[PDB]
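User: Predict the full complex structure for these chains.
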Amino acid sequence: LSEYAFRMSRLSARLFGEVTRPTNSKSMKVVKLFSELNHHTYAELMQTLRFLGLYR
Amino acid sequence: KNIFTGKRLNIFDMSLWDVEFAKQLATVNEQPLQNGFEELIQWTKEGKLWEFPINNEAGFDDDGSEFHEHIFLEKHLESFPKQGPIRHFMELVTCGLSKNPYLSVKQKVEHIEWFRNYFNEK
Amino acid sequence: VRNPRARVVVLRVKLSSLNLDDHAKKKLIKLVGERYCKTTDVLTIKTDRCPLRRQNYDYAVYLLTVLYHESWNTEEWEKSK
Amino acid sequence: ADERLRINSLRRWRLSRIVFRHLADHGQLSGIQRA
Amino acid sequence: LHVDVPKDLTKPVVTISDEPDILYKRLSVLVKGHDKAVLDSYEYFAVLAAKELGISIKVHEPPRKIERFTLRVQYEMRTLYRCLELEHLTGSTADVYLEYIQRNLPEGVAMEVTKTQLEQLPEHIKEPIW
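Assistant: Here is the predicted structure of the five-chain assembly.
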């Protein structure tokens, strides 16, 4: 690996927003972490409508 | 001769009440729906149906934010250490946040502020 | 109506249409890496970072802009090819 | 929740199988046929 | 209606704005459905409507997929595809055609439309910065 290609790889990292400083891969885990992000209502509604005289 | 020519008075030349007056005006042309197209038209005017051609981000603007607020979040790292290991940790944190398409800028800023706090107690 | 996949935007431009010299073309190609296909002379930038689609389109245009300007720039380390 | 995620950083139908079968077997689940 | 007809009809207002419109090279419409006959009828409808709207359209059939799973009781899903590639249509023609065919999208048929807009270089890229 030439020094030229290394400095250019970290330049392209600057361009595309990738981490310029190589943080191995172990510390990169939080990069992945931050990359991503009712029986009740049914139940009373049936029984609530029931004593009003329109459900069963 | 038509009734539109002749003598005239010659007198002149050239809140809740308004709300209910306009609502009563609406009743003048309040007819039952006459076919299905009319039903779809009324529903979409009411905001019931989807707009076509369908726009998957309809009704959402992300608070009018621009991309540079989502991609470049390192201006929230000014109050942190500039060269220690918190600079490493927080620069990498904001790199992670800048790749999150599910969050708005406000949540990202609040999250960065929480780290601000947490390190300051510590 | 929300579908998370609608934010993706894909910009495709043929590098022969960009006002690039030999050094600039070399630098652009080996910046982009696999985004550029040698067979087709087409560079493809896929942007999906931002929530909306207008933001991703703006980001893609901005990326292409900065890429052109930084390919047309010769740093100090560029001397030692 | 968010607090838990942060401190960590600092370091198909959703039905019972049988209820799926009855709906699936009665044709009540769209597109799910038997091979 | 044989005698009783509307005298005049209020056509919708279509104002010719002053901005330039988007241009689309291609507009690929991938419709996915569980039934081949439904997709064939939809293909007939879309192709015909494109013909009376002057839009150039070509149709092909991407390969079907099956998702099999087991609970032994073995269930299946079939997804069949139809791809309608329209060519050389402006922003407004595309917009109206898409509204029409999406409002007439049958049951169980999902749509994926990819639009290939045409743009010119930004002025920042015509010449290098000095």
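Chain B has five helices and no strands.
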